[PDB]
Amino acid sequence: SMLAELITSYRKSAAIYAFVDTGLSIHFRNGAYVDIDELSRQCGIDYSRLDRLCDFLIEIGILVNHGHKVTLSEECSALADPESMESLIVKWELSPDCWNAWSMYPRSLLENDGKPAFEITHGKSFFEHLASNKLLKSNFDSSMSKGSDKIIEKLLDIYDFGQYNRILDIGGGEGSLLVKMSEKVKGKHYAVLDRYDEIPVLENIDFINGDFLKVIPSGYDLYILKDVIHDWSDNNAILILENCRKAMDNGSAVLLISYMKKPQSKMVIYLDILMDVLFSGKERYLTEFERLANQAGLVIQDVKDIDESSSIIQLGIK
Amino acid sequence: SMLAELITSYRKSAAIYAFVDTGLSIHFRNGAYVDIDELSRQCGIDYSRLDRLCDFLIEIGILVNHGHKVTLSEECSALADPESMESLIVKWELSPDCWNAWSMYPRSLLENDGKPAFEITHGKSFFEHLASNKLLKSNFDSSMSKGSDKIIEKLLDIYDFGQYNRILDIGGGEGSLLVKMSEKVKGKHYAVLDRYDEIPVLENIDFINGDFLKVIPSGYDLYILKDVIHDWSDNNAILILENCRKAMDNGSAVLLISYMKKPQSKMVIYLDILMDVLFSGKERYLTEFERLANQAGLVIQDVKDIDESSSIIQLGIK
Numbered sequence: 130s131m132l133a134e135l136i137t138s139y140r141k142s143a144a145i146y147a148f149v150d151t152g153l154s155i156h157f158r159n160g161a162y163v164d165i166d167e168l169s170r171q172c173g174i175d176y177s178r179l180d181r182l183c184d185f186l187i188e189i190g191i192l193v194n195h196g197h198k199v200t201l202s203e204e205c206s207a208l209a210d211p212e213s214m215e216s217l218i219v220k221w222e223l224s225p226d227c228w229n230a231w232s233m234y235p236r237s238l239l240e241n242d243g244k245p246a247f248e249i250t251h252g253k254s255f256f257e258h259l260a261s262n263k264l265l266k267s268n269f270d271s272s273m274s275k276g277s278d279k280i281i282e283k284l285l286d287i288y289d290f291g292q293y294n295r296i297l298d299i300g301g302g303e304g305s306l307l308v309k310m311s312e313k314v315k316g317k318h319y320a321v322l323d324r325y326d327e328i329p330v331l332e333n334i335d336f337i338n339g340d341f342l343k344v345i346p347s348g349y350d351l352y353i354l355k356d357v358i359h360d361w362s363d364n365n366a367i368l369i370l371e372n373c374r375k376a377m378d379n380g381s382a383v384l385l386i387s388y389m390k391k392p393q394s395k396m397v398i399y400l401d402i403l404m405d406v407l408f409s410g411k412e413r414y415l416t417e418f419e420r421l422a423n424q425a426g427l428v429i430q431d432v433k434d435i436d437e438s439s440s441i442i443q444l445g446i447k
Numbered sequence: 448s449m450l451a452e453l454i455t456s457y458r459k460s461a462a463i464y465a466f467v468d469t470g471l472s473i474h475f476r477n478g479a480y481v482d483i484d485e486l487s488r489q490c491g492i493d494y495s496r497l498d499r500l501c502d503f504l505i506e507i508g509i510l511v512n513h514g515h516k517v518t519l520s521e522e523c524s525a526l527a528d529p530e531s532m533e534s535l536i537v538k539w540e541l542s543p544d545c546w547n548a549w550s551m552y553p554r555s556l557l558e559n560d561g562k563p564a565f566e567i568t569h570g571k572s573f574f575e576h577l578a579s580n581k582l583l584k585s586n587f588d589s590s591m592s593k594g595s596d597k598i599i600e601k602l603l604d605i606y607d608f609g610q611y612n613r614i615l616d617i618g619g620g621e622g623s624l625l626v627k628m629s630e631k632v633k634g635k636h637y638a639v640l641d642r643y644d645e646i647p648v649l650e651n652i653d654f655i656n657g658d659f660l661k662v663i664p665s666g667y668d669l670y671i672l673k674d675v676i677h678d679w680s681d682n683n684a685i686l687i688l689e690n691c692r693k694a695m696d697n698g699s700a701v702l703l704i705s706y707m708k709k710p711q712s713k714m715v716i717y718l719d720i721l722m723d724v725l726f727s728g729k730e731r732y733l734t735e736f737e738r739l740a741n742q743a744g745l746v747i748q749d750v751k752d753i754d755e756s757s758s759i760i761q762l763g764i765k
């Protein structure tokens with residue numbers, strides 16, 4: 130039934146985490162025809178239990194049965210590459226720390242405090258937890274960097290970044306967006322603000338150990354907030370945009386690169402539940418973004434659609 | 448994309464648990480048209496966060512939006528009844544204790560020590576854990592009874608239970624199967640063997656405290672194993688069927704009431720992975736059941752299909 134399939138949906142995700150995390154997936158790269166007996170003795174997993182996992186992976190369409198050989202479906206080929214966005218997302222999103230948080234989602238809905246499901250579980254915010262668990266932070270940061278690679282060409286096609294001399298990436302993490310921006314747009318001062326215990330060093334990009342909740346550094350032509358605002362409540366979102374305005378001089382711009390809530394925007398609705406559970410954030414309509422900006426003393430000057438589910442918002446003062 | 452949907456599948460399951468566990472589902476009984484603002488007050492969830500959950504429930508097809516009100520779709524109507532098999536399954540299967548176990552599935556595959564992911568999580572077996580958790584046990588036990596209620600009719604149609612004077616249900620739990628069998632088949636000596644802290648009393652039904660891994664009581668015409676064998680390794684299953692043989696005298700029979708593995712059989716493949724994670728069990732082919740029977744000193748006398756994924760298997764000593 131439809132109800133039975135929705136109830137058991139989680140098993141498909143759990144099996145994919147197993148397929149990637151155990152190291153099974155890497156044996157399926159380049160559409161290789163894999164023998165499960167060889168796979169069992171290579172990866173050191175009991176043949177019977179691996180053969181049973183493979184039957185489930187075949188059933189849900191991850192693997193394809195060729196008779197006496199199994200292959201990774203072309204649609205799911207990214208799982209074979211451990212550095213792929215999808216593989217890295219699987220390794221942090223479906224890891225115990227994030228997976229187990231969903232257990233406390235019902236409690237978080239009833240508590241009527243400020244604490245998300247992830248905070249109830251770990252007694253820490255998501256980013257506070259990442260500071261104490263390097264491997265989880267590495268997989269998160271890397272997946273985000275891989276995410277930036279997918280949209281950078283479109284961004285550079287739809288928006289003129291070359292008109293700005295000094296560009297700061299607020300919560301830019303590894304600084305992947307600006308590293309890739311540098312390859313086309315040359316001769317600019319590029320900085321990235323984020324919470325670093327060890328400050329990363331690249332030459333062509335500067336890095337600042339900062340806190341955008343308290344203060345944002347002044348003297349930049351462009352301030353970028355990519356997938357930052359959706360991590361935060363309305364008051365903290367205003368606090369970041371406020372701190373942006375306080376550091377701004379007229380002629381300077383803020384660019385928001387964000388997922389956009391629309392009526393029946395499937396991918397964004399799916400994402401919105403994760404943002405509640407993991408970050409206590411939310412996906413927002415353009416109308417909501419405008420009010421957050423207006424409250425912070427900023428005005429929307431232009432909106433351009435990257436995707437059917439994401440946009441860039443240019444902000445100024447007045 | 449197909450890969451992205453498979454990765455995020457778990458969120459659909461988590462949202463359904465939230466819908467039932469928080470008590471929201473009870474407001475949608477009898478195709479009731481629910482105001483989300485009214486629902487948010489009555490259940491004590493923040494309106495904004497409940498509205499976001501309902502948007503996700505609409506997307507995945509659980510809820511149906513009519514103008515300003517929502518109803519539970521006729522396909523997912525079982526969620527509104529807290530004693531529906533689907534509601535009871537949701538309340539044990541997607542509960543923290545079972546949900547969190549799936550995190551340790553990759554570790555359980557690599558360790559190769561015979562420990563299921565559930566045992567690595569809680570430090571004891573599912574059934575050992577049930578004896579220590581009354582709410583999880585109550586929901587599990589009730590869901591098992593609803594399982595017996597749904598198929599008892601088909602059981603009595605395809606099998607002559609009337610021919611047997613003394614009937615024992617090995618691992619019969621609540622005794623729901625024999626209680627329903629009593630209503631149609633009367634004047635028989637009905638007994639149930641399981642692990643009881645306190646022995647259930649229906650006076651007419653005999654409830655025995657025992658261990659089917661140690662010994663099974665003799666002097667019964669029928670020994671029933673319903674959803675027991677699939678909980679166990681091949682060796683523990685042989686031990687159970689050995690203890691049956693040793694208790695039996697010629698003319699007595701063992702009836703296995705069990706899910707059956709067939710090539711491409713979707714539902715059983717799904718269940719097979721849960722049996723690994725929670726019980727360190729498995730779903731088996733008829734040929735696998737025959738080897739276990741042969742190893743135990745027993746023979747298959749008859750096989751009768753309940754439905755597509757379920758069968759009853761008569762065993763005899765030979």
Ligand SMILES: Nc1ncnc2c1ncn2[C@@H]1O[C@H](CSCC[C@H](N)C(=O)O)[C@@H](O)[C@H]1O
Pocket residue numbers: 256273274276277299300301302303322323324339340341342354355356357360
């Ligand atoms: N108070 C704070 N000050 C600075 N950076 C912060 C912060 N809280 C969170 N961050 C950083 O904000 C980022 C949010 S994730 C998004 C990163 C990047 N814009 C991208 O497109 O992937 C993370 O790097 C996180 O560590």
Ligand SMILES: Nc1ncnc2c1ncn2[C@@H]1O[C@H](CSCC[C@H](N)C(=O)O)[C@@H](O)[C@H]1O
Pocket residue numbers: 574591592594595617618619620640641642657658659660672673674675678
């Ligand atoms: N060692 C053991 N000795 C006796 N009963 C056991 C056991 N290990 C597990 N069981 C019981 O085996 C049952 C398996 S679940 C199936 C319950 C019932 N036959 C039904 O289908 O509705 C549980 O009730 C559990 O308590």
